[PDB]
């Protein structure tokens, strides 16, 4: 499902080495390390990201995300 779509409001590197992003008012985290630079780059450049995942509740994990310049 498309959990959230929008700009990344903030991102955060966590002590457990996962990475959180807040999109469209909801926070999601991912343990996939290569998503860290991909998400931070999206955040910096204002990409629209679509967080996709089996379940989409705030504070939930994800490992699929689409990136669009718009």
């Amino acid at each position: 499902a498309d959990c959230a779509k929008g700009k990344i409001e903030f991102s955060k590197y966590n002590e457990d080495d996962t990475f959180t992003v807040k999109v469209d008012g909801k926070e999601y985290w991912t343990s996939r390390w290569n998503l860290q630079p991909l998400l931070q780059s999206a955040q910096l450049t204002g990409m629209t990201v679509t967080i996709k995942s089996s379940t989409c509740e705030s504070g939930s994990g994800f490992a699929e995300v689409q990136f669009n310049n718009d």
Binding site: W33, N34, Q36, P37, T45, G46
Partner: protein, 281 residues
């Protein structure tokens, strides 16, 4: 068109550059204060050039007055130089498309690039000194030059002249720094790494500045402008980007109210996870 760049005084020199700029370029709507702006070179056919008569090397004297630079108008490169006493145009190998009527054209084997000129000149631009005295020496070297292949001294002369003419036309920073050498104290202008960097980023800067709309800063590669006075104090004329494009098609990205050349951001945002990078040897 022919213009004179008169090195007699800082006033004559800046006046000369400003006159050239006004004729060959148009101010950017968003980077213009009074009549001092970042201007875009007006479109002209490739091959179009303007001549620059070098004057005033000996302050206000009609001496050392036989050198004319031929400048390709669209990109401000010095395509070659004319010895007006012998009526000979020494043209760089990469400018065979520039034809100057009425002179004997000597097509050179040497191309116009700084890479080549610095090599032949055995002179790096970073740290290169230019003074009124070395421009006179440079002038004499060019007038003594004959041949289809640049010599060390002619290359040094061209490096100095391109800097104080074409590069100063592009960059108000260089105009400002160099013009001090024209004062009665005759100090030496030393080209800085920062000056060199500007010259090396002219096309990139040119692609970005037209997009400026008052952001808090502009970042183009190694170049940073924190406000409009930094932009205006540094850049005077840019290429008409309508070497503007390196790759891609997106001039800029606004990030935290700073206008970035997109390529620059792309170049530090293309790293994968550091741990994976370093361990994946």
């Amino acid at each position: 068109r022919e213009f004179t760049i008169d090195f007699s005084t800082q006033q004559s020199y800046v006046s000369s550059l400003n006159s050239i700029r006004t004729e060959i370029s148009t101010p950017l709507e968003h980077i213009s204060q009074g009549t001092t702006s970042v201007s875009v070179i007006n479109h002209t056919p490739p091959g179009s050039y303007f001549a620059v008569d070098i004057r005033g090397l000996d302050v206000y004297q009609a001496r050392f007055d036989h050198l004319r630079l031929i400048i390709e108008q669209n990109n401000l490169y010095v395509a070659g130089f004319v010895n007006t006493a012998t009526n000979t145009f020494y043209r760089f190998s990469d400018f065979t498309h520039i034809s100057v009527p009425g002179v004997t054209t000597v097509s050179m084997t040497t191309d116009s690039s700084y890479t080549t000129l610095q090599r032949v000149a055995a002179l790096e631009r970073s740290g290169m000194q230019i003074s009124r005295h070395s421009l006179v020496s440079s002038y004499l070297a060019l007038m003594e030059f004959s041949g289809n292949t640049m010599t060390r001294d002619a290359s040094r002369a061209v490096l100095r002249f391109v800097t104080v003419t074409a590069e100063a036309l592009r960059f108000r920073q260089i105009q400002r720094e160099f013009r001090q050498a024209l004062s009665e104290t005759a100090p030496v202008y030393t080209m800085t790494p920062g000056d060199v960097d500007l010259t090396l980023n002219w096309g990139r800067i040119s692609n970005v500045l037209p997009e400026y709309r008052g952001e808090d800063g502009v970042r183009v590669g190694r170049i940073s402008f924190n406000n409009i006075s930094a932009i205006l104090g540094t850049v005077a004329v840019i290429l008409n980007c309508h070497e503007c494009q390196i790759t891609g098609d997106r001039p800029v990205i606004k990030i935290n109210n700073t206008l970035w050349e997109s390529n620059t951001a792309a170049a530090f945002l293309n790293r994968k996870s550091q741990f994976l990078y370093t361990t994946g040897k």
